[PDB]
Design a protein around this ligand. Sequence first.
Ligand SMILES: O=C(O)CNC(=O)C(=O)O
Ligand SMILES: [Mg+2]
Ligand code: NI
Ligand SMILES: [Zn+2]
Length: 331
Amino acid sequence: AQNPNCNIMIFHPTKEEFNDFDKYIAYMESQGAHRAGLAKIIPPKEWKARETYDNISEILIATPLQQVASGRAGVFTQYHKKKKAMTVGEYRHLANSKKYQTPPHQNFEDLERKYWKNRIYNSPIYGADISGSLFDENTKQWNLGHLGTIQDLLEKECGVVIEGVNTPYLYFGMWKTTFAWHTEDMDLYSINYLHLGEPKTWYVVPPEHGQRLERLARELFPGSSRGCGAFLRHKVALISPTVLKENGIPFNRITQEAGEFMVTFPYGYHAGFNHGFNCAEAINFATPRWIDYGKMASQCSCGEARVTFSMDAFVRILQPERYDLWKRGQD
Ligand SMILES: O=C(O)CNC(=O)C(=O)O
Ligand SMILES: [Mg+2]
Ligand code: NI
Ligand SMILES: [Zn+2]
């Protein structure tokens, strides 16, 4: 079995290997990459996402989110307070202000220490889930707006044609902006490209050990667990590396820099934080190997998780027994 310790693997495809996206995911899996739940892909030196980032300031962040924490430094939840709209140029100025900017630090490990010590005492503002793309239309390789759709994959594998669409999302971050512990909708893959700015630190649990994370989360967030049998779908809970280590939970960590892709694999729980002002683009995708994970994915039916239109068909076709209850939680 390849990669039996479930380490995060880093890949350096050549420009020739960068042509066929599906083939390269399958290659990474042949080397055991999925066992980690996360892989890094460094694009060939010849590749670029677009020519420059000099003209993005007028993109609108319609609903910036202030991420307010509750709990203790290593075990906390966050809620999202809606703020008034602002442009990317306004948000960048805000991220660089004395109130929000990255503190002085020695290296990524020192910054990670400071994040876990101090995150809860601040409320950073995140631009999330903004439909759109920063890939140039002429970028033919690994263009996250031109991937094969999840509806076409389900139709190819299973023969059933379904409604729905699959488009990318932009994220504008600042110091301390935080992504809570989660798997993707329907335990899909994700791919994330860091277009510009400061790094993103990731934590990930191997898919084979995801239920160990879920059991710890039920212990640490006991009221939330009584409220919902899949409350990590709410995307509000944080647990630090120190707490994970104290409780014997297998995990790994890595820092993504501008110009790098990350892939999350089906049922790979992940969480992380941004180092400073940045912009990322991400989308979900599927492969034939995903179908069995989609069929077994947990679901929130309490009403909190609320998701896209396109998830309806996935539940309806892959999980017909759960469909009625889940749809009630959607309405
Ligand atoms: O970058 C972010 O805030 C969150 N992204 C992801 O969870 C992802 O790409 O799957
Ligand atoms: Mg613009
Ligand atoms: Ni994710
Ligand atoms: Zn729920």
